């Protein structure tokens, strides 16, 4: 068990070696990631078993040890930063101006940043360092390129 805020790798020791399935945000004692990463399964902190608190397959979001605590949102104006944490690579910030996912229920921010599978759950930041969403759920365009939504839950 650990209390340290920060970005975390979600690894898998047993399956296909210690591989990376995704990334996650630890804040205020609560761990946040994308649902398809853990499938709402309990996780290990080395000494502490972290259990899912809230989940949503539709939003592709799950939280551990507490409710979803991230509520910062993209201002539809500023440039953001994907704190990308790719498998077997050091974390790095990637600045960009979000595109737009246009749905029937309104519009949400989308980032045209292409990173390998296992990067899902990587935080997207505003210029105050606040997490305005997670990376890893989106679409593939004709290019073969990748566009992810800025997936954010309610608090």
């Amino acid at each position: 068990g650990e209390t340290t805020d920060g970005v975390y790798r979600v690894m898998t020791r047993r399956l296909l070696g210690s591989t990376q399935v995704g990334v996650g945000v630890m804040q205020e004692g609560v761990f946040h990631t994308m649902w398809h990463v853990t499938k709402g399964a309990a996780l290990r902190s080395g000494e502490g078993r972290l259990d899912p608190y809230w989940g949503d397959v539709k939003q592709d979001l799950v939280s551990y040890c507490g409710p979803w605590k991230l509520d910062a949102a993209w201002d539809g104006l500023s440039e953001v930063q994907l704190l990308a944490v790719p498998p077997g690579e050091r974390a790095k910030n990637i600045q960009t101006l979000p595109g737009i996912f246009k749905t029937k229920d309104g519009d949400i921010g989308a980032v045209a940043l292409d990173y390998p599978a296992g990067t899902s759950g990587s935080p997207i930041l505003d210029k105050c360092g606040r997490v305005i969403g997670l990376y890893g759920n989106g679409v593939v365009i004709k290019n073969g390129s990748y566009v992810s939504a800025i997936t954010q839950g309610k608090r």
Partner: protein, 38 residues
Amino acid sequence: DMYIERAGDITWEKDAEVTGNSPRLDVALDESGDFSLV
């Protein structure tokens, strides 16, 4: 079973590289949480 390991502090880096387009895309979110191009 899975586990977690720290990857660093969450912070906005001063002069980070600027990339990516800003595309406007008509998409649909099905019940399974999957996005799809309209």
